[PDB]
Symmetry: C2
Subunit: 321 residues, 2 copies
Amino acid sequence: GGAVPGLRYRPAAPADPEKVEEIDRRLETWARELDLFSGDFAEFQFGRAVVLQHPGAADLERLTAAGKLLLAENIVDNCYCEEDEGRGGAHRGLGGRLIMAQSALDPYHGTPEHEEEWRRGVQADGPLRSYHVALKDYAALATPSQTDRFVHDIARLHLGYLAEAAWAETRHAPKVWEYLVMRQFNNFRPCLSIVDAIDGYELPEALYARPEIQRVTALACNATTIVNDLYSFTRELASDPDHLNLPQVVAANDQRGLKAAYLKSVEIHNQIMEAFETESALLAATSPLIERYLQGLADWVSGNHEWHATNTDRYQLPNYW
Amino acid sequence: GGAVPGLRYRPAAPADPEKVEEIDRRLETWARELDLFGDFAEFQFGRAVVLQHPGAADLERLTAAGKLLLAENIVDNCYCEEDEGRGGAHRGLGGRLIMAQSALDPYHGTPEHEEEWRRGVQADGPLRSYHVALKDYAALATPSQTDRFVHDIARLHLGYLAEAAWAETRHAPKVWEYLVMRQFNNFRPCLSIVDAIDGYELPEALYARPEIQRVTALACNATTIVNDLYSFTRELASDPDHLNLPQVVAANDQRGLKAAYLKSVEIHNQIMEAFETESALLAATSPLIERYLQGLADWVSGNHEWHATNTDRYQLPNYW
């Protein structure tokens, strides 16, 4: 009825409604105080998203912090990637707006005078304010190693944004593999970047940076990002048929119809999930800490899928079964 | 010898010619077997790394610094300075740079797509250079250190994309906004590797500290401004629309290029003074931090010497 038939996912327990509410309440107040906006905020379901995605969260403040980051991420995306610059003023382009967004996370250093102008520039736009203050509140809970991990994953995301915008401008028709390479960057990854911090512990960088740990993190991120493609397929087919998602790209390369492309896209997802779970299991047996991180990753993926599958307002499924 | 008058810099001991010469030989040899291609020594990659890494553990690690530097230049030249050839694939700067990032930061997915991606990276020189340079560096460095490098290259590519967006949209940045872009579009990926190249490791937990992040940026920003100062005259003739600190200062201040250039030197000096001053305080906290800060300083110093003595590529304006 609500989930994609044949899709591989672990059942997620339903989010504590009183937790969801308090989070959405807190996030609303925060957005207001930062002037980030006459509408119901609960409808975007940010509180529901983080409660599902971080079932092991150490406390409300850390859940709230995960929410602020997700909110900021969505604000920047919508205001810089989804909307063009208004006519008749200064014109910086995606590349220019994004580099200022990165600076909001990764602070500028120079002369006292130029730093002050930079600080004011960061205060002058809501999207930049949201990144700046979100990271600030997160950095108060997390280690510099953890914040630096998140900043790198945002850098990835922004490169992913710029790659997608480039292809759309140059009219590039990527093969499936190349689309998925872009989607490894243009990814939910920065939300999974924080699973240990939000749960109240740290996976040290020495472990995180290991190739085999980089691999399973990528596999989780790539799979759950594809989940977005699969649940957004129908709405995007109607609203902007030129937007790339995995089924469109499979269909454009394979030329065997959308239904075949969609079903195949589910199998690709399941294969990626399979490698995530098989390799996670092996890595989990080697270390209780690594184990705990992989469970955090798995739980994020699971909660994210549940959020998609039950958000019937924004996500509809095609009639392919 | 031939330095910007009034510029703040520290003496760099001359490069060992025997190493410079061997490094160049190795780099050209490496380049031919990866088929990335004339006198190759004219590029002076060998002299750059010898000057930039005076405390290098050995020739193998110097060579690794050369390969990274070489790969970074190849990508810059082929993707940022040159347009895609007509009549073939068109992916744009964004598209080419996302593949370049994947060359450093491996793709994971189904075995079929992973193999297609692998063939993709092998399919052109710029991606091959990144891929093999990093592989050679990772064999000598820790995974923390290679992650640090990948992050610095992500910064770089974002920096590229920012400078390109401005050229396209015809944006005239204020001086502060230009320098923000310049913190990303930066020599930083070469300063990223100074501990590993000298055969030790600054612990990431120390690297990640805000004060260490700050002094690192100060060093990187100063030495990158140094490139603006020495290339200014050349780019004046060849690419007047190419942004550098003097041009941006002059576009904003409107007091003429001479005034703007002298102001640019003063900005460099202030940022360099901050780096030295805050380095001095931080040094006493840890022998590893001290060694790292000296690596930064020696890189900045050698990079300045490299520019100041590359008579052929860089000239100075007649402002003194």
